[PDB]
Design a protein around this ligand. Sequence first.
Ligand SMILES: Nc1ncnc2c1ncn2[C@H]1O[C@H](COP(=O)(O)OP(=O)(O)O)[C@@H](O)[C@H]1O
Ligand SMILES: Nc1ncnc2c1ncn2[C@H]1O[C@H](COP(=O)(O)OP(=O)(O)O)[C@@H](O)[C@H]1O
Ligand SMILES: Nc1ncnc2c1ncn2[C@H]1O[C@H](COP(=O)(O)OP(=O)(O)O)[C@@H](O)[C@H]1O
Ligand SMILES: [Mg+2]
Ligand SMILES: [Mg+2]
Ligand SMILES: [Mg+2]
Lengths: 524, 524, 524
Amino acid sequence: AAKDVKFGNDARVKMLRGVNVLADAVKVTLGPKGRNVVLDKSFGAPTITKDGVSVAREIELEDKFENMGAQMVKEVASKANDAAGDGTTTATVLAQAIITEGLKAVAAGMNPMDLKRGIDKAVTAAVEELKALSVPCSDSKAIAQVGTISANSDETVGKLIAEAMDKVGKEGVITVEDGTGLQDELDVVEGMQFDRGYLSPYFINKPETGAVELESPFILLADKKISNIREMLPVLEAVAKAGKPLLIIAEDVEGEALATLVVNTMRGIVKVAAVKAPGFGDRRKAMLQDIATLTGGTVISEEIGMELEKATLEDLGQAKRVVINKDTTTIIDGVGEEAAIQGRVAQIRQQIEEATSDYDREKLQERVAKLAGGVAVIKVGAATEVEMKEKKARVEDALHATRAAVEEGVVAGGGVALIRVASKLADLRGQNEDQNVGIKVALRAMEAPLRQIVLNCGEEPSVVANTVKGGDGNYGYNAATEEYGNMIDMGILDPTKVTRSALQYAASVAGLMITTECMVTDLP
Amino acid sequence: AAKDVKFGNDARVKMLRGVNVLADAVKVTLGPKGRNVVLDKSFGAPTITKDGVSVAREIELEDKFENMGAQMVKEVASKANDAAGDGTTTATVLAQAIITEGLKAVAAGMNPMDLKRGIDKAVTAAVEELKALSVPCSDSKAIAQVGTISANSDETVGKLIAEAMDKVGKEGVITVEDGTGLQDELDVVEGMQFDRGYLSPYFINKPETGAVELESPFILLADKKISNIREMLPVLEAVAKAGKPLLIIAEDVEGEALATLVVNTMRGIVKVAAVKAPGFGDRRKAMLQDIATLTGGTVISEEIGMELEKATLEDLGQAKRVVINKDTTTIIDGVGEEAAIQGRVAQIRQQIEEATSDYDREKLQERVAKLAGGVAVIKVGAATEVEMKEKKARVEDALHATRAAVEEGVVAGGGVALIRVASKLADLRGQNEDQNVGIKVALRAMEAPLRQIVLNCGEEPSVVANTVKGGDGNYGYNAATEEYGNMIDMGILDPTKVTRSALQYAASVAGLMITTECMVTDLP
Amino acid sequence: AAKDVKFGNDARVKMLRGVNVLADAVKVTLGPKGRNVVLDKSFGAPTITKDGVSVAREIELEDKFENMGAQMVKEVASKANDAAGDGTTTATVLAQAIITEGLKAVAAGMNPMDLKRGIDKAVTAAVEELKALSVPCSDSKAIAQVGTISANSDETVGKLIAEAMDKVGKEGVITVEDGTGLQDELDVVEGMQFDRGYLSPYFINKPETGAVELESPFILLADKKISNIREMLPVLEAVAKAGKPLLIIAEDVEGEALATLVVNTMRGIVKVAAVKAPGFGDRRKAMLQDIATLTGGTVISEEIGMELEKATLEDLGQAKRVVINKDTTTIIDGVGEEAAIQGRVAQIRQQIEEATSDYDREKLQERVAKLAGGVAVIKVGAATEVEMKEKKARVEDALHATRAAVEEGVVAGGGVALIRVASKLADLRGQNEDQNVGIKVALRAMEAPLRQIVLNCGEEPSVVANTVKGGDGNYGYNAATEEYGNMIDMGILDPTKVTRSALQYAASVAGLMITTECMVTDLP
Ligand SMILES: Nc1ncnc2c1ncn2[C@H]1O[C@H](COP(=O)(O)OP(=O)(O)O)[C@@H](O)[C@H]1O
Ligand SMILES: Nc1ncnc2c1ncn2[C@H]1O[C@H](COP(=O)(O)OP(=O)(O)O)[C@@H](O)[C@H]1O
Ligand SMILES: Nc1ncnc2c1ncn2[C@H]1O[C@H](COP(=O)(O)OP(=O)(O)O)[C@@H](O)[C@H]1O
Ligand SMILES: [Mg+2]
Ligand SMILES: [Mg+2]
Ligand SMILES: [Mg+2]
């Protein structure tokens, strides 16, 4: 492939122009007054979104040299999204400013690497000052406020997420799904629920409910595929004599069991119901042990050393009450020893802290929530699918912000936290004059989010920036009410993790970009 | 893919131009005087239709930026069609007006999101006022009038649908099909009819009829595939002694049965006929239970715990009289206990209210109609297929409008309902001046359907709008007779659900569209 | 696909231009003096035809907007062909006139839908007046005259079809095939003939004839595949003792039978021949029952309850005399009970009147003709294949016209019937002035066929139209002799069904076309 090369300022000019095209589209979204971008999906209706990471992945430029600049700043937004749902737009705005100021310094002949070292020195110091500025958030009032700000000032979204925050507990997982009702509704599942349904419609003992309710059940957690009632019988006889209902969890079941079960249940000899084991593989096995510990029961298994037919009635688990639908299994309140259950939750927590796949760790979190916490799903409600998608993105970002707020605390919102940290690090000096110039580039860039929110509002950014810089503590401009007040008091709060992540990601990519002296790309 | 980006007014201009191209084609159809659009089907003759949703899906523009605007307003018409058959054109006209007025306000510098909040505040209030304005419709005179208006003023269509409305009852389902006779004919099926036919032509006991009529039959509702008369015999012997005819419903049947049955029937030993079970799968099983409850009989099944050959004569169902053709099975008046049948209809109604697939819910409605209501099919009649298609769309829309009218009542038609609700919500004020401007945009847009119907008539829209706005109650312009009168008295009625749905869908998509500040699309 | 849209007059102009291109090609053919169109078949020689439906399917225009108009008027000719073979050109001429007059009225600002209602009101009234004008045709003199006019004034074609009309009877079916002899010849098959031939050349008992003639045969109509003489023997022994010849009709036959049959027949022990059962499937079974009823015999079948070998000599059918060739089977005059045969013909007639597939109904008509009527084939004769094709189309149209004439009577030909009906409906008035204008458009269009026939002759259309309109009854212009006289007396007769069908089809498509206000089609 023939390669066209460009050098020095000419290369840096096209690279900056590409950064400007990406930054401009993301910049319009920044702020409560920020508008939305209609990204075009060719196979379908265009999508209207205020999410910066969404816009970033979409843009690429036909000028190859400009595209290289755009692709490199796409990274800061993408990693910010990986860290936390919010901060993707603010990271891009900070990165754009560091690149613009840095390129001007490189043009003055300042050594690019020395400026990079200076920028990094300032960022490391700033992150520490953000931790000092941070004050912890766990008040549900504060949790709602971080959610509301994260949802483009939607009070209802923050209010609902705080309640779901409340009900699930810390181990709990909150999820969002499309709900066709135009109002949002929150449902919190109680106890261990697996998404599997009764094998036979005949099993239903409550037809109006359409569900099988077994009060006081014993529970068999079985290994393997079991289509021999033929072999399982003496266990079954003992249960029939005992007279408590039974649940069978198992992997593969014929009519050999189900018709025999209908013969027994529907004519009132025995009281039984049966469900398919969740998911597949060794993940189903690991899960079955969690159920066994909860139910005061056993994973009853040939491959772990029991003939299944040898099982005694004490070898099974027990619990209060179960309800099963065609999609749903719920289990109320286990016989299992509380310290054993807490031990398994902690033993799982060791797996959670060691977990090398975050997505696998989420599944572990779902297992933590079934075992001790709760699962909450928020039904995002909108008249049209256009509205549903933008609504869900705002609710998802609120979910991520609330989690970040609890973990590492909260800082003043609207960019006043970055302004205050920059003022406190003004005397920070690097080893050489280029490092000193680099430190200044980072501090000036930190004022950029406040300026852009004010620009979107339409007020003069510099005049407002001067008033906020002149002010102290959390004094800041409320963009929505166009007034100056304490941000914490006015409810404008940003999670510390998202602000710290935005600075670190922007500085790393921007610092490398200023050092570029040659660009090599395919000839047009 | 190289992406070309546009910003601010330039982006909004092309987006509005795309909305205008779609809106203009749908607008011509609005009103009784509205003409028809010849959409071109490349594989076949072009289609002449007055249906807005049909036109909307068809249009796309080669200008990529304009196409994005057109695709987004296609949604309001498409969702309106999903909600109810009618309202697809009115929703587009309302949406076009809100976008045009909103874009002008955004040009004045009004904050786009604040206008969106104001528009939403007005719409929520307007929907409540439409419910107050709504008066219930169930008079067959009124049901015919909503059908007639929904069929471009076809009196015969409304008249026929009211009768079919009458005969089926509320649980009943009405369907439309092409009928080659040039006059429309309605046929109402009575009782449970499944579309399956006699397995053997030899079964016919009434050759001139070409159908098997069994008077006083017993009915076997069988499980599984049964090609062993070989095994079924002792049941069959008991019936032969009893001397009432029998029907066999079953899944798979050889000549092992049919020739033996011909040997018995055609030489007068026994009196029998046999049909194939309807559809396939577990849906056939769920259906067979409904037949069993109706016939005072049983789903006789190995897999639900009976050897089939053990069945007694009391274990079967019974009914008055059956008739079977090569396509058709009809069953007259069952032995089943009325409260058991009503219970199963209610138990099914629980499934209906829980039903997550609407299309599956329709099949449940067909099962409700076979069990307690009726099924009516309207044979749309036209000289040519060009005429048949436009005729059927008008009859289909009338079917949807009549159902909507019964459920949520009726409002004045011709746009006077939207004009009256807008007048009653004039003092509604939002939190800030942009929200106040947003409320006004929605109220002005509500006058748009009346204006467009008058424009299609050719009378001056503003002069008529002023007279209707000056008037009160249901006073409105009868477009067909070019006169002003009470709409309810003149028979111009619109279902409340369709008017409310049009406003809500238009407001949601339009409100998002005004907020757009940047558009990203593939380079031409 | 990018869509280019056009509106109002601009759209109507291109649509009319497309109608004009199609209409012009079909118009030249109208009239006895009308010339022929050389449609080009790319894979082969071009085809010279005077048939309008043939020309219509061929034409399409490269201008997309013009093509949409052409495709829509293709429908009126195509449906006219489906109704009856003739009337395809006259329907196009009537449709073109209604569209031209209607578009001019829409240009004057007349409401398009109101004109459509007026046109429809006039057409409904005109169809009733055509029924009053109609006088029944069944005289073979009149039947020949409708055939002659339908064959571009070919006296021989009408004369031959009247004789074939005569011989077959009403239940009879007449067919046309290419005959290489340059003179047309008619052959009428007598009685039941199926197109199957002797299985063995050795069966021939009359070698000079090349056919097997069995005088006084018994007939076995067998079920299934039978290659066991091995099993069939005791029946065969009884026949050999009886000494009347036998025919075997059956599905699949080895040399196991045929060599054994040659051993018996060719050495004079037994007298037998054997043929393959016609077609395939259950249609062959339904047909075999018709043969059984005719022959005073039985479908002898295991699957309908007889072991085949149990059959007695009375269980078979009998008839006068059979002749079989390698292609042909003929059966002369059955033993079957006449009221049973008439009953089966009537029982079949119930199937005929119920018949949902017209093409399947034709096969039922062939079965009606074999059972009670006759089958006649006309061998179209021409020197070249170019001539054969045009000759056959003219003979086919004559066949369709003669059938239409007998069913719904005859009206004056040359367009004078449409002129007279239009004069009688002049005072018909619609509800509003646009409906009145619509009625006038239809009446003026009805004069169009007469004008176009006169234009093709070369005489002034308006001068002749005035003389015919001034005249009364059947007074009309004989185009061939360029004279004015009573049409019935001069032999110019048109079937009422074809004239009524042409008006109805033209009005429906034309009425929709005038209402078009926007056209949407793919960008060139
Ligand atoms: N009234 C407000 N005052 C100032 N800024 C606000 C206000 N409300 C929300 N914000 C937000 O403005 C910034 C939010 O950025 P945003 O546009 O939501 O995308 P992202 O969080 O991904 O960067 C944050 O500084 C946050 O404070
Ligand atoms: N004579 C009439 N007066 C005013 N409007 C009428 C009259 N008859 C029917 N309409 C209709 O005009 C509008 C019907 O819109 P329409 O063109 O049928 O498509 P859609 O219902 O999908 O919006 C409704 O306001 C309805 O009232
Ligand atoms: N001598 C005649 N006088 C007037 N018209 C004639 C004469 N002979 C045949 N015609 C025919 O002219 C019209 C025949 O139309 P034709 O060209 O055969 O195609 P099509 O029947 O499909 O419309 C009919 O009105 C018929 O009467
Ligand atoms: Mg954010
Ligand atoms: Mg409508
Ligand atoms: Mg003709």
